[PDB]
């Protein structure tokens, strides 16, 4: 839960999951970038954010 993460400020769990490549779902109202480039998808830019 992103709201709970922002409220508590404890980033241990999310940092551990991101460093260990553990599949997760970050839940919460987020803005997103709409990218229509196929080369961007092949370059796997979505995984770099």
């Amino acid at each position: 839960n992103l709201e709970e993460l922002m409220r508590t400020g404890d980033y241990a769990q999310i940092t551990n999951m991101l460093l260990n490549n553990q599949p997760v779902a970050l839940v919460g109202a987020l803005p997103f970038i709409t990218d229509s480039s196929v080369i961007s998808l092949v370059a796997k830019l979505d995984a770099t954010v």
């Binding site: 508590t8 400020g9 404890d10 980033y11």
Partner: protein, 49 residues
């Protein structure tokens, strides 16, 4: 290193060398240096950056 010393001077210098007050320092020592009740308080987020 080689040194030339009177036995009393050697005694003093050897005592200084053998009984230094410095000790290894790591993130664990710093983390334990923080008071425990502050490390368990969820209002404070402590990180080792």
């Amino acid at each position: 290193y080689p040194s030339i010393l009177h036995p009393i001077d050697h005694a003093f210098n050897e005592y200084f060398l053998q009984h230094q007050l410095v000790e290894p320092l790591n993130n664990d020592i710093i983390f334990n240096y923080i008071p425990e009740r502050i490390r368990n308080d969820v209002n404070y987020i402590l990180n080792m950056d």
